[PDB]
Amino acid sequence: GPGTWENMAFAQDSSAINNINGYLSYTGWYRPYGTSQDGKTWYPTTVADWRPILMYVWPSKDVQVKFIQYFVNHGYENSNYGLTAGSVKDLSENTASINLNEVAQNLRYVIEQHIVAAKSTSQLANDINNFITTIPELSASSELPDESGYGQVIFVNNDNTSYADSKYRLMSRTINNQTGNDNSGDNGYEFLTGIDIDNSNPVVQAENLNWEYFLLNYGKLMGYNPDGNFDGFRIDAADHIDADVLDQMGQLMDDMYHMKGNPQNANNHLSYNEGYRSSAARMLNKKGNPQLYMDYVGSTLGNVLGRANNRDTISNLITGSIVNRQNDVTENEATPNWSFVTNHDQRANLINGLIIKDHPGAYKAEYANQAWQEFYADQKKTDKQYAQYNVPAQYAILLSNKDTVPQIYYGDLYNETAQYMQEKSIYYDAITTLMKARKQFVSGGQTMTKLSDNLIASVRYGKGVANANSEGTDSLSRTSGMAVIVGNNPQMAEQTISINMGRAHANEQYRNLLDTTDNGLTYNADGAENPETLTTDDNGILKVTVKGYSNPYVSGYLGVWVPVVSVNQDVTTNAATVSADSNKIFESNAALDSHMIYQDFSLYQPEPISTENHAYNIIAQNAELFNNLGITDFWMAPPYTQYSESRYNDGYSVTDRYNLGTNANPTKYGSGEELANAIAALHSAGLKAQVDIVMNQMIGLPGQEAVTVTRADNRGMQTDVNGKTYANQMYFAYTTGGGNGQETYGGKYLSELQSKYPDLFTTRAISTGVAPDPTTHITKWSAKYENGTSLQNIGIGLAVKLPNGEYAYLRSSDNKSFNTLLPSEIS
Ligand SMILES: C[C@H]1O[C@H](O[C@H]2[C@H](O)[C@@H](O)[C@@H](O[C@H]3[C@H](O)[C@@H](O)[C@H](O)O[C@@H]3CO)O[C@@H]2CO)[C@H](O)[C@@H](O)[C@@H]1N[C@H]1C=C(CO)[C@@H](O)[C@H](O)[C@H]1O
Ligand SMILES: C[C@H]1O[C@H](O[C@H]2[C@H](O)[C@@H](O)[C@@H](O[C@H]3[C@H](O)[C@@H](O)[C@H](O)O[C@@H]3CO)O[C@@H]2CO)[C@H](O)[C@@H](O)[C@@H]1N[C@H]1C=C(CO)[C@@H](O)[C@H](O)[C@H]1O
Ligand code: NA
């Protein structure tokens, strides 16, 4: 006949029981053989009838007790089955098992009543979820977030999860710790956020070369616009990945384009690494500079000019950089670098920040519209609280600085939350003015002289003018060069200053390119304290009148001077095709200094309302504008397909490294067809395009996997979150995925790469001593290619452990290791 034996699983395989690599979860569901509402009648289940494992099986009697009470006190009481707040109140872990199981069974009869009554298992599912949050052990809090709600676990080897084992996982082998011989030092840590990819794994390192080759040939390989090919890379999280891959990328690029001897070929394939750590400069220098180093002078800029209060003194613009500009009168000596006033991450750090001020760390609903209104309202004020002061002055410094490839932020030229390029920012005129002036005037040596604690003169001596005493070698010498005068004190007394324009600019006239007034900036001298033109004396000294002002554009002083000319000039230096040093890839000099990068996106860029609004399409339409502005090198957003639930849908939350969008499923930026065209439009204007390559993480991978984990700090060593920790734990992490793109293109070009450039696969990597391995292709990511994950908000108590200490297990398809062990209550 019938009975409670019907609580067994219908069958002990995946078809009737949820599992992940054979293991069961307390959030899992299974198909009993039958259920009952009263005790007497038992209905054989259909394959559509599933119930939560937490109705039948518990981690401990304590939790079994709390499951019964919480359900009774949330509408599953029924006195006719001895279930009232009163009848369950006194139950405890020391209550008899035989008794507790009688109660849980009787609760199970009422649950079945609710299911029929409400015609679904939905309120039940919702109740289970809520119950789990009350149990510290099963809750997401058991994975031990740190004080700021962050943290990560590492994937370690384990006899239960041996399919996820790795011989590699060499963590924090970054920068100057590639060999693992200075773990304690200035190296930059392994973990940032998301599922961390193991870039020490020879197969992964081979997959990166594949990926890079796909992107350097994107349009050709995809049969889109065949000139729609990236020329180089912008390297995300370069301080946070085994530095082997920065070596390897540079090797591939030198193999493909012959960059080492040829400054022309190098400079046509610019690469730049994100990461200001001074140690990175050191590292890149020792290596012959395969990529540009990311300088910190933008932080100096914000601290000296951008703050409302607490403004670091003016002389920090001279020394507050990987390059000292006291008197920089030499070439090929500075660390080849890229610098900026702003990037995507600085805006975010401000916008988040406004988000927690306005709304007390609460339900993070989308009142990022409110944070943005506040930003835009503050951006226009003279007395700003949040936004940056002196934005034009900062770009004046950035754009006149020798030995750097400067980087403009889309967001500083355009209102980044409006549709792409639909709204210019109030700073567009100023910045673009200075950008054009750079092309025409900014070359030669540099001298930054202090004149007070608040006032500086940054002079460039002009093309082919090495220093203050030089005569002039080029025929643009006389009519090029610039003086940038910046005061960071808005109450600075009016006064007269002297500026040495060099011995090659005696009795020369100077245009007042840009000057400060009561209201802002004037481009023709109207409203300022200086005339449209001034002249130098015999020794090349310029008298200028300066004063403190306070308006939305300037808090202090900004003035800029350039030679009078009747013509357009362009002071770029072509790279000659024979490097002063054949050990170098990149060299800091006039040729490299003639480059300028544009960051073409913001995280808060909105979803396009239509195809006409795809950033890719609008870029293709405005390529000549970018060229006019003096931009040579385009940094394009990570173009990869994203996690559906990502906050900003921005490119950094990667589910498919090869799907750059299709016509019906574009990214925020557009389709791959449209990307390839956008790239080709830029090429058509003589620009180059670099892609943002994200080797560090993947996010929103839909496949769960039973892995074994240790709560670890961000370098990869275990850590204690205030007393507590845990190691060698079963965790049901999202680790597996990649999409058709990883399946279709994974490892596909390694044959071609090997035949064309064998050295890639015989050169031994520093961190491993072993060459990249092209003999396995990665067509799907999983835990075995991953160091770990940022805390996934799941919990560490989900894996069902039998009373005897062993994890519950099921022999299934992939699952074919040990013997099937199921709880007493489900078999
Ligand atoms: C991972 C997250 O941030 C990434 O940018 C990182 C830098 O790559 C990282 O080095 C770090 O900053 C500095 C580093 O601490 C230091 O050692 C070195 O001297 O200089 C580094 C350069 O700044 O922190 C920033 C972030 O603040 C990438 O931009 C993204 O991968 C990612 N950004 C976002 C995106 C998403 C998803 O769309 C979020 O999930 C993520 O939380 C968020 O930060
Ligand atoms: C519907 C409309 O919206 C489109 O914008 C898209 C993005 O291009 C796309 O990335 C997609 O992004 C992710 C989204 O944030 C996330 O919530 C979801 O779960 O996953 C998506 C991909 O991972 O969604 C945004 C919008 O949220 C384009 O701008 C439009 O072309 C697109 N077309 C629609 C609407 C119109 C407009 O009239 C029709 O003409 C068109 O036929 C229709 O397909
Ligand atoms: Na990493």
Q: What would the DSSP string read from start to end of 183-230?
A: TTSS---S--SSEEE-TTSHHHHHHHHHHHHHHHTHHHHHTS-TT---
Beta carbons of 738 and 779 less than 8 angstroms apart: yes
Tell me the pairing of strands 293-294 and 337-340: parallel
238 C-alpha to center of ligand 1: Å? 10
User: What CA–CA distance (Å, rounded) separates 149 from 163?
Assistant: 30
User: What CA–CA distance (Å, rounded) separates 451 from 356?
Assistant: 41
Q: Read off the DSSP letter of residue 298.
A: H
DSSP H/E element including 248? helix 244-257
Instruction: Give whole-number Cα distances, 539 to 477, 510, 535, in Å.
Output: 16, 15, 11
Q: Which residues have a Cβ under 8 Å from the Cβ of 474 and sit 6 or more positions away?
A: 463, 464, 465
Which ligand has an atom closest to residue 419 CA? 2
User: What CA–CA distance (Å, rounded) separates 436 from 459?
Assistant: 17
Q: Which atom of ligand 1 is nearest to the CA of 642?
A: 38
Beta carbons of 225 and 679 less than 8 angstroms apart: yes
64 C-alpha to center of ligand 1: Å? 43
User: What CA–CA distance (Å, rounded) separates 41 from 45?
Assistant: 13
Structure tokens at 526: 């109207």
Residue type, position 196, single letter: D
User: What CA–CA distance (Å, rounded) separates 659 from 662?
Assistant: 8
User: What CA–CA distance (Å, rounded) separates 388 from 303?
Assistant: 10
Handedness of CA 411, 412, 413, 418 (dihedral sign): positive
Structure tokens at 368: 């990022």
Residue type, position 551, single letter: N
Residue type, position 308, single letter: A
Q: Is 312 helix (H, G, I), strand (E, B) or coil?
A: coil
Q: Round the CA-based radius of gyration of the chain to a whole number and report it.
A: 32
Domain 144-203+698-747+761-790 CATH class label: alpha beta
Using alpha carbons, select from 489, 488, 447, 493 the residue that is nearest to residue 466.
447
Site of tokens 């009795």: 507
- Residue 285: how many CB atoms within 10 A of its CB? 15
Q: Which of 186, 191, 193, 337 for a ligand 1 pocket mutation test, highest count of atoms within 8 Å of Cβ?
A: 193
Is the distance from the beta carbon of residue 696 to the nearest atom of ligand 2 less than 6 Å?
A: no
Q: Which residues have a Cβ under 8 Å from the Cβ of 101 and sit 6 or more positions away?
A: none
Q: Read off the DSSP letter of residue 453.
A: S
What does this entry list as its resolution, in Å?
Answer: 2.7
Q: Which atom of ligand 1 is nearest to the CA of 192?
A: 1
Q: Which residues have a Cβ under 8 Å from the Cβ of 107 and sit 6 or more positions away?
A: 68, 71, 72, 76, 81, 83
Give the residue whose CA is nearest to atom 26 of ligand 1. 345
Q: Which residues have a Cβ under 8 Å from the Cβ of 149 and sit 6 or more positions away?
A: none
Beta carbons of 648 and 702 less than 8 angstroms apart: no
743 C-alpha to center of ligand 1: Å? 28
Q: E-assigned strands of 685-784?
A: 688-693, 697-698, 703-712, 729-736
Q: How many helices (H) and strands (E) does the chain have?
A: 22, 31
Structure tokens at 814: 């992939």
Q: Which of 196, 241, 339, 345 for a ligand 1 pocket mutation test, highest count of atoms within 8 Å of Cβ?
A: 345
User: What CA–CA distance (Å, rounded) separates 557 from 544?
Assistant: 12
422 C-alpha to center of ligand 2: Å? 19
Q: Which of 419, 646, 649 for a ligand 2 pocket mutation test, highest count of atoms within 8 Å of Cβ?
A: 649
Q: Is 542 helix (H, G, I), strand (E, B) or coil?
A: strand
Q: Read off the DSSP letter of residue 328.
A: E
3-state secondary structure 403-441: CCEEEEEHHHHECCCCCCCCCECCCHHHHHHHHHHHHHH
Residue type, position 341, single letter: V
User: What CA–CA distance (Å, rounded) separates 790 from 195?
Assistant: 6
783 C-alpha to center of ligand 3: Å? 14
Buried b (16+ CB within 10 A) or exposed e, 151-188: bbbbbbebebbebbebebbbbbbbbbbbeeeeeeebbb
**CA geometry: angle 312, 518, 556, nearest 5 deg:** 10
- Residue 799: how many CB atoms within 10 A of its CB? 21
Largest Cα–Cα distance in the chain? 115
Structure tokens at 509: 């006239």
Q: How was this structure determined?
A: X-ray
198 C-alpha to center of ligand 3: Å? 7
Say how far residue 321 (Cα) sits from the centre of its chain: 23
Is the distance from the beta carbon of residue 272 to the nearest atom of ligand 1 less than 6 Å?
A: no
Beta carbons of 400 and 407 less than 8 angstroms apart: no
User: What CA–CA distance (Å, rounded) separates 228 from 536?
Assistant: 49
Is the distance from the beta carbon of residue 610 to the nearest atom of ligand 2 less than 6 Å?
A: yes
Q: Which atom of ligand 2 is nearest to the CA of 642?
A: 23
User: What CA–CA distance (Å, rounded) separates 650 from 811?
Assistant: 41
Torsions phi, psi for 407 (to 5 deg) = -130, 120
How many residues does the structure list for the chain?
Answer: 827
Q: Which residues have a Cβ under 8 Å from the Cβ of 80 and sit 6 or more positions away?
A: none
Beta carbons of 390 and 305 less than 8 angstroms apart: yes
User: What CA–CA distance (Å, rounded) separates 197 from 651?
Assistant: 16
Structure tokens at 416: 């980044």
Using alpha carbons, select from 139, 261, 276, 183 the residue that is nearest to residue 580.
261
How do the domains of the chain map onto residue ranges? 4-138+810-826, 144-203+698-747+761-790, 343-387
Using alpha carbons, select from 103, 116, 125, 127 the residue that is nearest to residue 41.
116
Tell me the pairing of strands 555-563 and 541-546: unpaired
Is the distance from the beta carbon of residue 714 to the nearest atom of ligand 1 less than 6 Å?
A: no
Q: Which residues have a Cβ under 8 Å from the Cβ of 7 and sit 6 or more positions away?
A: 32, 33, 56, 825, 826
- Residue 538: how many CB atoms within 10 A of its CB? 8
Using alpha carbons, select from 375, 409, 415 the residue that is nearest to residue 395.
409
640 C-alpha to center of ligand 2: Å? 15
Instruction: List % helix, strand, coil for the chain (3-state, nearest 5).
Output: 30, 20, 50
User: What CA–CA distance (Å, rounded) separates 119 from 128?
Assistant: 17
User: What CA–CA distance (Å, rounded) separates 113 from 41?
Assistant: 12
* DSSP per-residue letters across 551-584: SSS-EEEEEEEEE--SS----PPPPPSS-S-TT-
Q: Is 533 helix (H, G, I), strand (E, B) or coil?
A: strand
667 C-alpha to center of ligand 2: Å? 8
User: What CA–CA distance (Å, rounded) separates 562 from 264?
Assistant: 29
